[PDB]
Amino acid sequence: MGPYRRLWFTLIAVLAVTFALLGFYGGEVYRQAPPIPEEVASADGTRLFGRDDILDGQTAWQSIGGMQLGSIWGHGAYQAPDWTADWLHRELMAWLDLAARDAHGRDYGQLDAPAQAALREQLKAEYRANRADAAGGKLTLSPRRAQAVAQTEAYYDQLFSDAPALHRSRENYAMKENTLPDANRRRQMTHFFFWTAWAAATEREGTSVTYTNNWPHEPLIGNHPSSENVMWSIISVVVLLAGIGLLIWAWAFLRGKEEDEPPAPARDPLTTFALTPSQRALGKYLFLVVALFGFQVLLGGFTAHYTVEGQKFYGIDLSQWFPYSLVRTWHIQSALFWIATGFLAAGLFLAPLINGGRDPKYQKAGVDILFWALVLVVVGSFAGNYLAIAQIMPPDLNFWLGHQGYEYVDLGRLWQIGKFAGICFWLVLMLRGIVPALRTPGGDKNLLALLTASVGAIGLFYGAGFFYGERTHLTVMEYWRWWIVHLWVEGFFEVFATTALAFIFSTLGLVSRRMATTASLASASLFMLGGIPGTFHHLYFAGTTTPVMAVGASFSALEVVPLIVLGHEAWENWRLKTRAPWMENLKWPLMCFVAVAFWNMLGAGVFGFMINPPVSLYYIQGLNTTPVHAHAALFGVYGFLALGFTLLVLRYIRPQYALSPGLMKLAFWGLNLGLALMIFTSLLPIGLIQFHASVSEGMWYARSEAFMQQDILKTLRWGRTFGDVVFLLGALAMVVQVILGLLSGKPAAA
Amino acid sequence: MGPYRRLWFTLIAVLAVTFALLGFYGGEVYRQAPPIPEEVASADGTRLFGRDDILDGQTAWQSIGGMQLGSIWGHGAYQAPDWTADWLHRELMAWLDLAARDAHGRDYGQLDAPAQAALREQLKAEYRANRADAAGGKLTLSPRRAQAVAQTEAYYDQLFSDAPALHRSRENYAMKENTLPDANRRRQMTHFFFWTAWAAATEREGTSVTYTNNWPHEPLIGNHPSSENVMWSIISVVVLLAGIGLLIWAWAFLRGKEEDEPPAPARDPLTTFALTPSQRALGKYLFLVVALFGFQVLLGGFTAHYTVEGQKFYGIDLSQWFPYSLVRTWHIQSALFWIATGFLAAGLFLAPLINGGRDPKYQKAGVDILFWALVLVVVGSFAGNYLAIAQIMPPDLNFWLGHQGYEYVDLGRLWQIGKFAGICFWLVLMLRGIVPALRTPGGDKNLLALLTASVGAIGLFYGAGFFYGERTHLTVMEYWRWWIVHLWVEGFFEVFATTALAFIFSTLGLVSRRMATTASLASASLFMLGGIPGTFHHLYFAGTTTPVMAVGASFSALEVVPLIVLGHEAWENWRLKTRAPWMENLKWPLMCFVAVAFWNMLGAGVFGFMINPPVSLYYIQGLNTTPVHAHAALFGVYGFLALGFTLLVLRYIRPQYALSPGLMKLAFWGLNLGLALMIFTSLLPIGLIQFHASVSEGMWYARSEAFMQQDILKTLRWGRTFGDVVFLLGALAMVVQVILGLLSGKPAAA
Ligand code: HEM
Ligand code: HEM
Ligand code: HEM
Ligand code: HEM
Ligand SMILES: CCCCCCCCCCS[C@@H]1O[C@H](CO)[C@@H](O[C@H]2O[C@H](CO)[C@@H](O)[C@H](O)[C@H]2O)[C@H](O)[C@H]1O
Ligand SMILES: CCCCCCCCCCS[C@@H]1O[C@H](CO)[C@@H](O[C@H]2O[C@H](CO)[C@@H](O)[C@H](O)[C@H]2O)[C@H](O)[C@H]1O
Ligand SMILES: COC1=C(OC)C(=O)C(CC=C(C)C)=C(C)C1=O
Ligand SMILES: COC1=C(OC)C(=O)C(CC=C(C)C)=C(C)C1=O
Ligand SMILES: [Ca+2]
Ligand SMILES: [Ca+2]
Ligand SMILES: [Fe+3]
Ligand SMILES: [Fe+3]
């Protein structure tokens, strides 16, 4: 250790305290998870279904793409409805039509507002009070509810079949015809849908708050944000602004003038080390990064196609094979794979450069095995998803081989274990290069310690996804899944990137190593403080209680703090272009890392915070504001990191290859301005129109085909094409650029 | 001009565009102001009251302290209810009791939720649809409403009298017994109360939105934030975070390295110029600053006393003479006077130092006349308010001599003209010192131009308060009043301060003058951009339409941007302590200006933004979050500025007088930590408990005696005493310190 004990003990302290909050409120997530009533029975006494049928329905839902086909509890895809909200609304409306007929022999819609208000009050009384027995033993539905449920089951049985009545709906929902062709599976699935709506609509014992924290916004049962949601929402903003103001104050006042900026080396240091065999073995990883990235981008276009034409594509019904659910899955899964691969490549490039520019024994071996391991996992998983969504996949294999139905962990459990083994194997290849450099009785090993930590965090924190299986409770799946998607990606990828950059720039002699170790420990602490408990900003409405929402709100506020100030970091890293004339070769990677800062600030920070205070998210969860954020944050940050890192590794593994300034201006500006156009001209306007709808009418309405198929939204969804094309141009330029680079040095190992 | 053309044209552009938005949406504020129906009649045809009675009631309300005694449309004092919300709730509940009796011969409270829901639906139908005729000609009340109104009039007739039934309420409301002793005036006043509740509860023609933008939160008539409110609220946060992120990005990338830091002079430059006669004439202004400040602080304690014991003070009923309404008025009015005087003194100290350390002819004259002019205005206004609140003041003199009843412009119109004439006269004394320095055919006159602009902005933008008279529509009063309180204080005082500091530090040779002119033009643009349209964040619910709320929300978001980054500015100004050994003499003033930055960030920025997005404010307007902000922002920023400036002028006009490091550590830390304790241990917890109540039940409930008199709130109101005392200690230390200073070397503290 040495001059960074404080920054270390602060990181450890942040980790300790944060994983306390995450792990403790993890016990409260498990405990307060909406019961799955062993038995759902009508009051008349007839057994409707039970746990096993709700869970069987979870698996059927999984098998069809789960969260890749609309949403549950506001998690998943956005073209189909939130099934919970849609179900809730359809069941409550069915109930109200039965209520209204019983009491007035007119339908609810036919009644005067006062009759309607009284019905709504009886609906609310019934639905909100409809807890299962103690031990979540038996849920009795009133016969009206049992009936509402029966006729809501009927509706979804038709929607998820080939039933021509609901063809327009499937088109509008980018559902393939016969999404879920087994009638039993569809029935079971409706049980699952029921259960989520039920949870959504049932107050927790001795609360005014549903198991989903009154999610979704369903005025009919007085699902409105809790007052606590509203509390923590205001607190989050204060936490955020306090946090920024104090961070800037701390930084302004606790820098200490800063010193030690030696002249940059004469020669790029990283060009002094000869490419190890395992470093030249990364061309194919760079290929895979751009291949998957280009694939991914096309899959977004394919996905985006279905949001404007749910089924045909020049009159061939592509949805039979490549439905929205599949291409959305692939779109997301491919994003992860190519981003991960960028990072994995970045790391593997560094590993042998960390043990003094020499390969650990069998590092080229491992770098080639790891590569095919990843391609296997990608092809297998993708095939698995195809087969899951095609409904070829035996239901009882679906979760292993098919589609977990959980967004970002969609790949079958087998492939997920493959991916984990891959990433663990990469942990070994990294540590093969980093352990010697740690065990060498030498100088400042603190950046490298932070890196090996980062590397082990990547290495192992993807195994958080094995704490849920197929029939695990959504709330528990949700808990663990957001370890992966939020903690492992948005946290441990960040720190590994930031640490690997700090390490590269320090190694390049652009930054002292003190300045790097210090910068990257302080960053670690900054990101992890908000990051780690910020996992909960995904679990507000996932069957979780208000504490989870408090932690999530407040700590997600803290997570924005370091993002919003990234203007300064960005400039610090961009400054490095001028430190040495050879930094012109790292121009583009450096432009990426500035785009990372930019999008971290805007995408992750601004658009993450837009949707983060429970009260905002309460309404906008599962609206187009998420994909705004998701695009801006995942691509803008980790995509540009991965590409930046791609271009960096390319700079070194094709050291004579000069990037085309034109191609890279197109690649870089196409991506940046494509991404801004997608967000600002399509996704964000839509998310806001939907936010309006969600707030005005309810979540069901914001997600509803009638609403989603209105002309403004059709035009805004069509207008996405501009940004999508500007972006595909950029992505194409980037893909070509890297391909040309790779083809400029042995075209037959890529 | 010269190297600052861009920064100038940007300031002019910001001013142009901003005063466009303010002046344009000012036409929309006038046009969309809730009608005052010429006639209010029962449907049965009986004339209840009219315009003249509502306006007469406005004057009666004014006469009793207006906004210094609870709130109208969430503007005013917080110990009494919001009368609009309280009235609305009492009338709607009365209506519901009449409804419930008509239909069920039980009271609303006695009915089942469904009956209650149906009644609420009929209430909502009636109240929301209850527009006046076209031309705001006649408002017909349903006889039930006419009755609800009659029995709500009765309640307030009793509350505002000596009626022993409502004694506990008056105590809880810090209302004096016989607050409004004329029965007619009270009746008229209830008409006014009615009208505000009516506006609050009536949808605008062809909207779902009341004249007050559904304010207050009154679930009974589906007064909930508009979807637009909710829209602009999310946009504001995005505008804010985008704004910070981009500002930091712009700053990070568009600084240009920065150069020209000459060695600080050897001798304090300002000690080289001999004190002009008009500068020594400022001791008494410094006295008045601390006298009013100490008075003000005691008045806060007196005010705070009434929030825990509405009437007695060791068993003598002080409320007969010095009721909460009076001492709150004085508390606020004194704040303005001593803060203004700080600035006016600061300016007058600079005036002769700007025309080369020599007094314009008759500057000592003017500085003495201006002083007694201010003391006259302070004593007269204060006497006026006493007499208004005592109800001695003839009602028809009340608005001229008494109490305008509008917060921060409470002083009678005469005194307000006095204050304006004073500030205009100060404009002349400033320009007496600044015009020569501008007309001298010389070098860089751009800071001094920005200063003379700032000075003219102070000089004239207080005359915005003469665009409303006594019987002016609240919405129009509100429009103009917030020019004064928000624009003139929170905008033109800021820029004058910042410019006068830039000017002082530049004159001291601590900053280039380029760096000053540049810093202070960029600041001007930054503050004015958000500041000026941010006036509207006061008018969201004041009878204004959604555009006003959009502008207000978005531009108030922009106004936070420069505040949150002030950590950096603060450090830049604090840096100056080290530039010259003689800056030890300006240590404390510099500590003030850092406290200004701190509180600008936290008080104005964090706590201003806490309460700023229409959706937050919708619920928290008139809750203890405002006084948190108001204390932290007005004292923390302008109070410390004024005191900073006080200590600075003291440093020079008592140039041999050394400040007591102990006294000033107590003064400074007592104020800072007193202010933090007041906010964090009392006001903020309360505001949040009330926010909870406001969101859960409605504004009426959050402001209601039952709620406000709960034990937690009693304890939190009592616990204020800690911070109040720590603060009074600080203030006392500061007052003594300045007194001792003034009493040193020829004692001149008039
Ligand atoms: C032309 C480029 C792109 C297009 C047209 C596109 C389109 C889409 C579409 C249509 C969706 C689904 C919205 C829905 O659920 O109905 C989506 C989701 C997503 N896209 Fe993209 N995409 C593009 C690029 C990218 C890139 C480059 C990344 C990351 C590398 C990415 C990551 C994602 C993610 C993570 C989701 C899931 C978002 C969420 O659930 O909020 N996309 N995209
Ligand atoms: C680079 C950093 C980040 C990345 C890569 C990232 C990525 C994502 C992605 C892909 C999603 C969509 C997840 C889903 O479909 O269910 C998401 C959702 C979300 N993110 Fe981020 N994020 C980042 C930072 C942040 C920050 C800083 C915040 C808030 C402070 C935040 C808050 C959220 C919230 C609240 C959601 C949920 C939206 C919803 O449930 O519909 N994220 N994030
Ligand atoms: C010991 C010090 C202080 C105490 C105990 C105190 C107390 C109070 C109280 C009790 C209120 C009225 C809350 C209500 O409406 O019921 C109030 C309002 C106010 N105080 Fe103070 N005060 C203090 C210091 C100051 C100082 C130093 C300033 C400015 C120089 C100031 C400015 C104000 C303002 C502007 C209001 C009106 C606030 C609003 O309506 O939101 N106070 N104060
Ligand atoms: C130093 C700068 C500022 C000062 C001196 C200041 C002062 C005040 C004062 C004294 C109040 C209470 C007014 C009243 O009683 O009706 C107030 C209210 C308010 N301020 Fe500020 N303020 C400042 C900056 C800001 C900022 C930066 C924001 C938001 C971006 C803001 C937003 C508000 C809002 C929304 C209210 C209304 C609260 C309510 O109506 O109950 N202010 N300000
Ligand atoms: C500052 C951060 C900004 C983001 C966080 C703000 C989140 C917004 C809070 C939403 S309040 C929401 O508004 C709703 C309507 O606008 C209101 O709900 C009601 O209103 C309907 C009128 O259309 C009414 O018919 C329904 O009974 C009901 O849905 C209510 O304000 C709440 O749901
Ligand atoms: C960033 C800061 C955000 C500030 C804006 C705050 C957001 C306001 C949205 C709250 S919606 C509002 O909440 C109220 C309760 O919290 C709701 O109350 C209602 O339903 C509740 C039972 O479900 C209960 O309180 C009452 O029975 C009933 O009046 C209210 O209708 C709802 O719109
Ligand atoms: C409007 O929906 C869309 C398509 O189908 C109609 C596309 O094919 C395309 C074409 C471009 C790509 C990225 C495949 C885009 C952009 C798209 O979003
Ligand atoms: C001592 O008791 C109290 C008062 O009178 C009842 C106050 O004046 C005040 C104000 C504080 C001072 C300086 C006594 C508060 C808050 C209080 O609790
Ligand atoms: Ca999703
Ligand atoms: Ca007030
Ligand atoms: Fe997240
Ligand atoms: Fe304001």
Author numbering:
A (entry chain A), B (entry chain B): 1 to 750
From the publication, what sentences describe this entry?
In contrast, qNORs are single subunit enzymes (NorZ) which use membrane-bound quinol as an electron source. Whilst cNOR is predominantly found in denitrifying organisms, qNORs are also found in several pathogenic bacteria, where the enzyme detoxifies NO produced by the host’s immune response.
In our structure, the Ca ion is ligated by seven oxygen atoms, OH Tyr78, O Gly76, OE2, and OE2 Glu407, single oxygens from propionates of heme b and heme b3 and a water molecule. Analysis of our cryoEM structure of AxqNOR and that of PacNOR(7) has highlighted an attractive alternative route for NO entry, which is also compatible with binding the cognate partner protein CuNiR during turnover (indicated by red arrows). The conformation of Glu490, the gatekeeper of channel entry from the catalytic site, is different from the previously reported structure. Here, it is hydrogen bonded to the bridging hydroxyl and W2, in contrast to being previously directed into the channel and hydrogen bonded with Glu5599.
